[PDB]
Amino acid sequence: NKAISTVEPHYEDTAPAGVEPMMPGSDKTPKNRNEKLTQLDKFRFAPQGESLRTNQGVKISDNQNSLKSGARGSTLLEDFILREKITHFDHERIPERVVHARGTGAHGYFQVYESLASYTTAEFLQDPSVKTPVFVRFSTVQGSRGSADTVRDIRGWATKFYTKEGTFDLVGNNTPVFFIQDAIKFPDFVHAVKPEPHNEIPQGQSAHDTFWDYISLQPETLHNVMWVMSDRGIPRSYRMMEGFGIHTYKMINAEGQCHFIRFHWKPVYGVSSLIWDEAQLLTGCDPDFHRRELWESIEAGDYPEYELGLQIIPEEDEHKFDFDILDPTKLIPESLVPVHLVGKMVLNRNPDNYFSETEQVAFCPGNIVPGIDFSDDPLLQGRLYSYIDTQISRLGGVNFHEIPINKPICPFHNHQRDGMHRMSISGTANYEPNSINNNWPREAPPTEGGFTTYPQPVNGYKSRKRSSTFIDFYSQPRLFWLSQTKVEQNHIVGGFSFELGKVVRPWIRERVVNQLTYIDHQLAQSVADNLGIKLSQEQLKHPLPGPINGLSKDRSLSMYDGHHQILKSRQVAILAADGVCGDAIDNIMKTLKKYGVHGKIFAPHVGRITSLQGNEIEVNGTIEGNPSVMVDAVIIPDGEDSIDSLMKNGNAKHYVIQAFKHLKAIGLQGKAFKLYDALPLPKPDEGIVVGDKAADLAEAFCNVMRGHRIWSRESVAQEIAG
Amino acid sequence: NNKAISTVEPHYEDTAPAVEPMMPGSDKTPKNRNEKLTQLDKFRFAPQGESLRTNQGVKISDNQNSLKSGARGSTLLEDFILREKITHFDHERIPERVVHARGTGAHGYFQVYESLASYTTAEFLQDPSVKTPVFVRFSTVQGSRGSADTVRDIRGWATKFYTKEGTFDLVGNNTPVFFIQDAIKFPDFVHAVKPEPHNEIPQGQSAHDTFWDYISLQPETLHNVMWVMSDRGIPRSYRMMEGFGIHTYKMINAEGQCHFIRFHWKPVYGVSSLIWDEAQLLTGCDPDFHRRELWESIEAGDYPEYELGLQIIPEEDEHKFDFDILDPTKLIPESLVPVHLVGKMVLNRNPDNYFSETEQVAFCPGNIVPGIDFSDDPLLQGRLYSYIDTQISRLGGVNFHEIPINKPICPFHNHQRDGMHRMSISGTANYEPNSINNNWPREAPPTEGGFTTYPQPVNGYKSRKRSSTFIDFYSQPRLFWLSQTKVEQNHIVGGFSFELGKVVRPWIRERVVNQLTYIDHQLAQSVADNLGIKLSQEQLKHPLPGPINGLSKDRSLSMYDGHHQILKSRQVAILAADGVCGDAIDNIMKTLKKYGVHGKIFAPHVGRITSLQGNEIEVNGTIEGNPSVMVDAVIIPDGEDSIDSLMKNGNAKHYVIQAFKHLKAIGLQGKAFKLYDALPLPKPDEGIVVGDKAADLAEAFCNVMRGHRIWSRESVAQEIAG
Amino acid sequence: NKAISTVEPHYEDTAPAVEPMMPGSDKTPKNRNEKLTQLDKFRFAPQGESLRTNQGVKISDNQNSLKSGARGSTLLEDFILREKITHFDHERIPERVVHARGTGAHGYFQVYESLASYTTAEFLQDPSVKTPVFVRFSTVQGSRGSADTVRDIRGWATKFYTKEGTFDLVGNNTPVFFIQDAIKFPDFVHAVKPEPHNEIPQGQSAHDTFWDYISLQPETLHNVMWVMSDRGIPRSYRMMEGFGIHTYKMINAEGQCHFIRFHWKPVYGVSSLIWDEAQLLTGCDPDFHRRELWESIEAGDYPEY
Amino acid sequence: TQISRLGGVNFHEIPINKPICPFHNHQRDGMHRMSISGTANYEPNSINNNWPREAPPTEGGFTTYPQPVNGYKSRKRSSTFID
Amino acid sequence: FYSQPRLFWLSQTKVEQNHIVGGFSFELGKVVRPWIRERVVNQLTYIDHQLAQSVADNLGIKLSQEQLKHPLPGPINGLSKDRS
Numbered sequence A: 001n002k003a004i005s006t007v008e009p010h011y012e013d014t015a016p017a018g019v020e021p022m023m024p025g026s027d028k029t030p031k032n033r034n035e036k037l038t039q040l041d042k043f044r045f046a047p048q049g050e051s052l053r054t055n056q057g058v059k060i061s062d063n064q065n066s067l068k069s070g071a072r073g074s075t076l077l078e079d080f081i082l083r084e085k086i087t088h089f090d091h092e093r094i095p096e097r098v099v100h101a102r103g104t105g106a107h108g109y110f111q112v113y114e115s116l117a118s119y120t121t122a123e124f125l126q127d128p129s130v131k132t133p134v135f136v137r138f139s140t141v142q143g144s145r146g147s148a149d150t151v152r153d154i155r156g157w158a159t160k161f162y163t164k165e166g167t168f169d170l171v172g173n174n175t176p177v178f179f180i181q182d183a184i185k186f187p188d189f190v191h192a193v194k195p196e197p198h199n200e201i202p203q204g205q206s207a208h209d210t211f212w213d214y215i216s217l218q219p220e221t222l223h224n225v226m227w228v229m230s231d232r233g234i235p236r237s238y239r240m241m242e243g244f245g246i247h248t249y250k251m252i253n254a255e256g257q258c259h260f261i262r263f264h265w266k267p268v269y270g271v272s273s274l275i276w277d278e279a280q281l282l283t284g285c286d287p288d289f290h291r292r293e294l295w296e297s298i299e300a301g302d303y304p305e306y307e308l309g310l311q312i313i314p315e316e317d318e319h320k321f322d323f324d325i326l327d328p329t330k331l332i333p334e335s336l337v338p339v340h341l342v343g344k345m346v347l348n349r350n351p352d353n354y355f356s357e358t359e360q361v362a363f364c365p366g367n368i369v370p371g372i373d374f375s376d377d378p379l380l381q382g383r384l385y386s387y388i389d390t391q392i393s394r395l396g397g398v399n400f401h402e403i404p405i406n407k408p409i410c411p412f413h414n415h416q417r418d419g420m421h422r423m424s425i426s427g428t429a430n431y432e433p434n435s436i437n438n439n440w441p442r443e444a445p446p447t448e449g450g451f452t453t454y455p456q457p458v459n460g461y462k463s464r465k466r467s468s469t470f471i472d473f474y475s476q477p478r479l480f481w482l483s484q485t486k487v488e489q490n491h492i493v494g495g496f497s498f499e500l501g502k503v504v505r506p507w508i509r510e511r512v513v514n515q516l517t518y519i520d521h522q523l524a525q526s527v528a529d530n531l532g533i534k535l536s537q538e539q540l541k542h543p544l545p546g547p548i549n550g551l552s553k554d555r556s557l558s559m560y561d562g563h564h565q566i567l568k569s570r571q572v573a574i575l576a577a578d579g580v581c582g583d584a585i586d587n588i589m590k591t592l593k594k595y596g597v598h599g600k601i602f603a604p605h606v607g608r609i610t611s612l613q614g615n616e617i618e619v620n621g622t623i624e625g626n627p628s629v630m631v632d633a634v635i636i637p638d639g640e641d642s643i644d645s646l647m648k649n650g651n652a653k654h655y656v657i658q659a660f661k662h663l664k665a666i667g668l669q670g671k672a673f674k675l676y677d678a679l680p681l682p683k684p685d686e687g688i689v690v691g692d693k694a695a696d697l698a699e700a701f702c703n704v705m706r707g708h709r710i711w712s713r714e715s716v717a718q719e720i721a722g
Numbered sequence B: 001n002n003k004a005i006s007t008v009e010p011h012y013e014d015t016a017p018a019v020e021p022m023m024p025g026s027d028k029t030p031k032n033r034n035e036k037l038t039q040l041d042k043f044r045f046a047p048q049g050e051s052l053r054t055n056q057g058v059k060i061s062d063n064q065n066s067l068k069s070g071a072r073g074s075t076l077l078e079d080f081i082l083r084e085k086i087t088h089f090d091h092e093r094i095p096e097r098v099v100h101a102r103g104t105g106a107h108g109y110f111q112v113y114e115s116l117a118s119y120t121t122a123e124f125l126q127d128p129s130v131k132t133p134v135f136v137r138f139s140t141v142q143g144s145r146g147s148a149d150t151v152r153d154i155r156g157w158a159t160k161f162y163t164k165e166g167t168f169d170l171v172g173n174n175t176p177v178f179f180i181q182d183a184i185k186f187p188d189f190v191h192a193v194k195p196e197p198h199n200e201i202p203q204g205q206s207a208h209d210t211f212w213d214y215i216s217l218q219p220e221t222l223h224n225v226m227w228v229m230s231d232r233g234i235p236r237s238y239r240m241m242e243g244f245g246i247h248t249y250k251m252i253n254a255e256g257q258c259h260f261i262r263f264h265w266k267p268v269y270g271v272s273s274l275i276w277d278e279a280q281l282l283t284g285c286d287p288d289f290h291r292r293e294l295w296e297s298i299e300a301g302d303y304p305e306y307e308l309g310l311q312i313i314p315e316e317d318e319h320k321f322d323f324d325i326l327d328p329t330k331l332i333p334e335s336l337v338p339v340h341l342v343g344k345m346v347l348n349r350n351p352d353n354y355f356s357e358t359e360q361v362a363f364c365p366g367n368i369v370p371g372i373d374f375s376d377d378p379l380l381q382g383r384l385y386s387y388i389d390t391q392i393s394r395l396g397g398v399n400f401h402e403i404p405i406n407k408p409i410c411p412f413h414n415h416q417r418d419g420m421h422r423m424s425i426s427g428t429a430n431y432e433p434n435s436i437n438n439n440w441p442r443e444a445p446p447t448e449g450g451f452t453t454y455p456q457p458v459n460g461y462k463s464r465k466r467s468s469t470f471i472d473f474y475s476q477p478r479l480f481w482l483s484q485t486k487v488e489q490n491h492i493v494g495g496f497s498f499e500l501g502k503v504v505r506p507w508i509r510e511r512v513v514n515q516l517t518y519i520d521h522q523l524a525q526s527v528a529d530n531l532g533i534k535l536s537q538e539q540l541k542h543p544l545p546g547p548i549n550g551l552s553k554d555r556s557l558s559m560y561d562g563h564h565q566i567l568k569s570r571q572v573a574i575l576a577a578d579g580v581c582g583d584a585i586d587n588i589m590k591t592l593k594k595y596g597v598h599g600k601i602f603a604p605h606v607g608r609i610t611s612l613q614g615n616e617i618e619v620n621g622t623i624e625g626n627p628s629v630m631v632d633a634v635i636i637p638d639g640e641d642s643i644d645s646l647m648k649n650g651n652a653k654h655y656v657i658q659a660f661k662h663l664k665a666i667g668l669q670g671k672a673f674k675l676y677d678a679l680p681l682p683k684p685d686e687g688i689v690v691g692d693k694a695a696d697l698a699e700a701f702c703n704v705m706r707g708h709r710i711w712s713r714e715s716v717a718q719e720i721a722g
Numbered sequence C: 001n002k003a004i005s006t007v008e009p010h011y012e013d014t015a016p017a018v019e020p021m022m023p024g025s026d027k028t029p030k031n032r033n034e035k036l037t038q039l040d041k042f043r044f045a046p047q048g049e050s051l052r053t054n055q056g057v058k059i060s061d062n063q064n065s066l067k068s069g070a071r072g073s074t075l076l077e078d079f080i081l082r083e084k085i086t087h088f089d090h091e092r093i094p095e096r097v098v099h100a101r102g103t104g105a106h107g108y109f110q111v112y113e114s115l116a117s118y119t120t121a122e123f124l125q126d127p128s129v130k131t132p133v134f135v136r137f138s139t140v141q142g143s144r145g146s147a148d149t150v151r152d153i154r155g156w157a158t159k160f161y162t163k164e165g166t167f168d169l170v171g172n173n174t175p176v177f178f179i180q181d182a183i184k185f186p187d188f189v190h191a192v193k194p195e196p197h198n199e200i201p202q203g204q205s206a207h208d209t210f211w212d213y214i215s216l217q218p219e220t221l222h223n224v225m226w227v228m229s230d231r232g233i234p235r236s237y238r239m240m241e242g243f244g245i246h247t248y249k250m251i252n253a254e255g256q257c258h259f260i261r262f263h264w265k266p267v268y269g270v271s272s273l274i275w276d277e278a279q280l281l282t283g284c285d286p287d288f289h290r291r292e293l294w295e296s297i298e299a300g301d302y303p304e305y
Numbered sequence D: 001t002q003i004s005r006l007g008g009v010n011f012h013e014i015p016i017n018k019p020i021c022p023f024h025n026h027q028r029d030g031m032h033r034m035s036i037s038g039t040a041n042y043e044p045n046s047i048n049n050n051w052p053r054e055a056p057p058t059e060g061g062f063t064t065y066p067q068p069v070n071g072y073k074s075r076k077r078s079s080t081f082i083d
Numbered sequence E: 001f002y003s004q005p006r007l008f009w010l011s012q013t014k015v016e017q018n019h020i021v022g023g024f025s026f027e028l029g030k031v032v033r034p035w036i037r038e039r040v041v042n043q044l045t046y047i048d049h050q051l052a053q054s055v056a057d058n059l060g061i062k063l064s065q066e067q068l069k070h071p072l073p074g075p076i077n078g079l080s081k082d083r084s
Ligand code: HEM
Pocket: A096, A097, A098, A099, A100, A103, A137, A138, A139, A155, A156, A157, A158, A171, A172, A173, A178, A182, A183, A186, A245, A246, A247, A328, A361, A362, A363, A379, A382, A383, A386, A387, A390, A391, A394
């Protein structure tokens, strides 16, 4: 009977009569509310106690069998329940985004610190009491929907502000510049970096011939190549990277005064990155690492938190720099123009349905609000036409603003009608001006908030031509290079050398290092050596760029110079087996909890382990299923029986070797050193903390961790086999 | 001027000025409501006092001008306001319906007279106190959108019942049978009747070679061809035609017993039709006649009302007929199986937005509800697949049930997810069986309303073969013929003759006429004569079918033998110019209103005319703008100046000649007879009412109108130049 | 036997042992050009071929679904039925948002003398070259199945397939348009199109919203005059004028710009219907202009402009 | 699924999907129609002498094997499957 | 807005002018809201007074003296008519 039951209608109950699973945001954080989420409640489905039905509302009695001509016969065309279930499934998929297909979404809110009326009339930047809702999607660039999170790529960062005066979309990246200057080159650049069109190889990688062929022939790309070749290209979390709108925008105030503006997002949890070998392994054992990290951090209360910052330039200072502020391959150095922190954004609710919310969300740089305006940046100008154009195919037509995640929370009356999947039913005149409805809805005068374009002077000739002022390809790459710590420079050389290693045609590699000789002679020579290229005497004498408004370095372009390492919310592995020391774990956990750090007990099997004190303690998962690359640091408590089993276990001995090679902090209590001493690992350096007392060993352990990575270990780490 | 310049600058002031036009149903009849219309209220937005906005909620300040470089310069790509407005316009159109593209909809409600629990468990048929909302779309078949209403064609009649146990679609036609027997022939039939593939000619007509080519080679089509050749093919109004589901369905009661069922709609306003010459002129001067007639019926309170009837056949009687009840080219004569009137449907509210509601509604025969089931009609079986398949591309994907007009008014939880334009947001398990949500939504046992298929026996071999019980093509066409009055038979001969006259290939005309010799010899003879064909004496004695289950004729297949002529809601033209007798008009008007007739005053100009008594009378429209084909009858009041104006007006004199030739009633008061006597018309017959006192004459006029048309005049009228 | 024959597979001849309109390849096969020769690669010739599925499988019985017994239920495994029905279900594509109602023909263009003085445009350089064209004529307001002889602007779109690119001259049969700035097109078109609550009227500007918009926008009056005149109701697409409306530029080999407006001047003259006659034609032949064009080409009275 | 994945009912006209043999029938139109057809688009016709034509089973026309079918209309898992 | 409507009107033969009048009169006669017909007829008084008077008569509109005295546009680069 037990078996027969499973292939018959299921009228009975099936439920049985870290610790907890990820759940929809409405189930785990229902108290994190905002105005947009309340609007989305109108479309949420609560199925408790409901019948299974067709889409026309008809109750289904047997969801286990097709209508057949007998129990062993042929399926009947009149089985409308079967066909409706299969047809819906057949049409589930919609096109992925042409770029940034791979992405993660969360809900939140934004508050302005104080009014910015001095700069902009934008409603959401006027009143610090308002909680204006937001939805953010983070993304990679090159890979399709199912590619890995921790690839070496640019990360996209798109924030939708549901304001009372319109929806504003801030659509940026995690590096302050882009690869190209004119939007007309976007298909060329994207085709070059995407998988090649004959074999569709490789996925989520720029490490191939067509990409570097393009770089080598378009020096304007070099600056942002530097950024992706650095550890910026492999962030540890979406909570620990920076954000930039990249383009110079405009803000107009109540007086009609124009300020040029560049947008910034500064992480409250600091700026931290992976290292390349650890990033690549993480894509094998968890392609969802960033998506999972963001989701769990919100369910844990370590809400992503970012401060919106603005670089502000008076319209008269437009030409005060050695670069064009309209050139998206140029950053504005924070020395020259400081970033004013103007408000805070917090992400505190996961979506309920990924496809409905994250997949269907539409962001366009053209979605501005009164108080913001566009500059003549010729890359931004192309983006204004592309976002809306692509969303008509991806999202089914021109009514994609009626999709719940995309609706504004303000009114939005106009004379537009019809289109595919038209939701609203409009009774009134559909042309303007009309008299039969007394011309409602009516144009809004500027003094009442109607959008106007700032009247910027426009002079020249109709021409296709790159501005003379855009022709500066090497200076900002050099600024970025000289601004990096020694270990960050080595990692940039690593990225270049690994990537060009996968390039088949030699002349592309040669042309690329040749481009590097115009940035820094020692960067070019390091990369040339890793690739067997001998530089000529002429190449070694290649002219280098001078400073930029008297600047040769800028500390802000470095990650590990200004000690932007936050300890709250990091993850620590605790390698325990049966026979571990109970009191140690408690004191490790109490110390970690004191610092906002999460520790996870990893054991050979799942469930519980029993301590030498005879008590049972819950495991978070196996050592095998949670390698060191998923945690920030390892700690091994004492317990002779625990240590003995760990030493027989290849995964747990490798756990420490790999933790070591990836420059992480390793804590060893008591005879735990028994395990370190067994491996081919050198004498404990500054990131190896031994000790017999757990709270003290934990306190010192948490303090090695404040440095993120033991950069000193790097040279001896290379020679360790593992 | 300063007013001139004003028209092309933002319009911030009022445009309105400080018998009625057609209006949305929400403006005209807000009192008429039901559960479906209350649901649609959520999707209706009021624009009064509201700003013109973008779809993102941004107030627009200038709707009159593109963003340009200079007031005489080039248009700029950053004008996101212009591009959004134009892009939405650009994507307004969706594919029209592949058949029945030309249609018109209305809202209403349905009530069952008493419980049908003896025959079915269908919820909406159990409880007379329940008001089930409906939406009904009427249509032609062949024409595209924009084709004319009063073509000679089959009329579609689709009714959507929004019940509490699911949405039920009764998708019918206005004739009791269809052209073909098997769904695999439908594309061939449709391609044959549609415009021809090389030149896309003719629109709205079956009168062309390929259609009659298909008929001559497919005799199974002859029965419905007789229906559409008769006056049933040109109905006067959607309120005055019959409706049929055509197929035999099944009804299943609580005891599991099965009754074979056929659905009927009986119009309380009667069954009446135009004549061919009138129908064709009407397509010229009002292609929207029926769509307008329906709209204005509801606004005038002349609501379309119909009784739902059932022919009810116990299971064991299935094979007691001389034809197969599963054959869709066969009707079940009402003399054999009567139609039981089981309920009433009232259409009492026009839509607000035609596209949102009439264009986007989706109906399928497979959308049945528990208590109803399908039969093995092989045409019906193929229909179940077609309606959902066409809608996935016509309505933009598999979520077209989430478009407001298609949503059910009951719950509809299931495990379907995603698809284009996904409105719902679901959090719970998306598979069945599941334990992580205790298997909600859950399958419903049949005794809780779970849908089940009645366990009909199935025996045979897999094969493609026409059932021998279907090969019976001339019986029912002859039965239909013999059931017609001689006037109706004459018009059938006219339909055939006119249509075949437009076929170019003479052998097509000859082969059709040969098919007619197997239905009736006089019919074949009369059509042959009009086509210049000579029949052999062999053809004049081709064997004819005999009676069907003891009937040679059935008066219910006739329109005019019956007495279904309703005078209320008909239209009357009152021809008048200045100097008309104003007391006469007032008395005519009072009389017409007494019988619910609508008199419209048609003059040589709009505005007002002036009574010979010096009074102003408001005019409905011009004589030239409202020819006699638009009204049911004509009455000319007295006033010698009016009659003398009307006598110099060629259109006014054509009004009487045309209405005379279209067999309509004409009243002439006093000197008005002077107009009639100058026309080359014979002596007043029974349809020409002459009289001096206005009310007296109007009374006799209304009585003549009770007969619809003056059939006796037909031969006299052929001679008349007009 | 004859009766049953019609519901069984037809493996026999059906043709019998003043002339209908026919596809261009059957009536005027000698009239050819480079474009038509290119289209030939996509013409199917079905004489002597088996009826087949789209995957190439021969079909034995096109008269019957696959059932469980001759009186039974249709089976889901009938792939032939579902392929044929599915393709029928998906025949329709959206109509053009304006000019939905239209009529097309192939032809050629020749230049009289080189226009090198004014333009470098390849197709206006060499008089010995026949440039293939395809022309579509249309109304504006009505949907696909609306009548021909309505009162409306007529669209007149010509595709020149030149050796240096496809050039499209997309014009009307009046020399001016109703509005000045594109931002107003959706308002103008919405005002003229059938009204949104009832979708009335078809193929007519004679309704409130259109004239409401005219009354508030005097820039429309010039073209409103053209369509209230007998320009609004032409006798034939062969007897109307054509215009690009807009000023274009033409650039010669020396970089010199001239302002240009385009004109089509019909060789068969400019003739129109009168209003009452045009309205009656829509009733008794809604395809009148479409038919007239097809038939004039078939008779040798080629449209020339 | 392929009607929406590949853009309509004419995906067999995409080169990789086309057969290498003839495939005449009466199907017409649909999105991105590449074939251009002049002949009658319905069957049976006489204006084209009914070409293209059904093929007898003995000349290659597809037929279903006449398998016997006996039972009741039913939603049920075969007991012969419970294993 | 009015100069070229007047040029086009003055170029028409009298029968072509009569047909323009019929076009306006028939179309406006199907407009329901009377103020729309009036506003349009008013617009015509700025093009040609006899055009406006004929159409206003067909629609039963009485024109005011201000309307019959509405200022008309002048020649276009010397032209008042163009027979093409
Ligand atoms: C300043 C450099 C650029 C940045 C920072 C940028 C940023 C982004 C981001 C973050 C997304 C993903 C948005 C999401 O999550 O849905 C995106 C998508 C996209 N971008 Fe860009 N982009 C840039 C340049 C361009 C250019 C030059 C074009 C082409 C003109 C372009 C066209 C697109 C398109 C078509 C999408 C997909 C939009 C969708 O399907 O919803 N972008 N961009």
